[PDB]
Specification:
This protein has one domain (1-64). Helices cover 47% and strands 0% of the residues. The protein has helices at residues 21-27, 31-42, 46-56. The chain is elongated. The protein starts with 20 loop residues before the first helix and ends in an 8-residue tail after the last helix. It comes from Homo sapiens (Human).
Length: 64
């Protein structure tokens, strides 16, 4: 659950986020929308397709 046999954490792993916490809360309330609406769009049917095709066209050369 914690890679690296030397994790100090506590006031050291988040001490860096405490600075972004003030930003994320701002750029993390209206930015996730587009991201998703854009992710589940070009990252839902695109990967599957390009993936499926790469197995139908790659299995040979091009449109058999």
């Amino acid at each position: 659950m914690e890679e690296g046999g030397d994790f100090d954490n506590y006031y050291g792993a988040d001490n860096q986020s405490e600075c972004e916490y003030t930003d994320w809360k701002s750029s993390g309330a209206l930015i996730p929308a587009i991201y998703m609406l854009v992710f589940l769009l070009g990252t839902t049917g695109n990967g599957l397709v390009l993936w499926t095709v790469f197995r139908k066209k790659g299995h040979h050369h091009h449109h058999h």
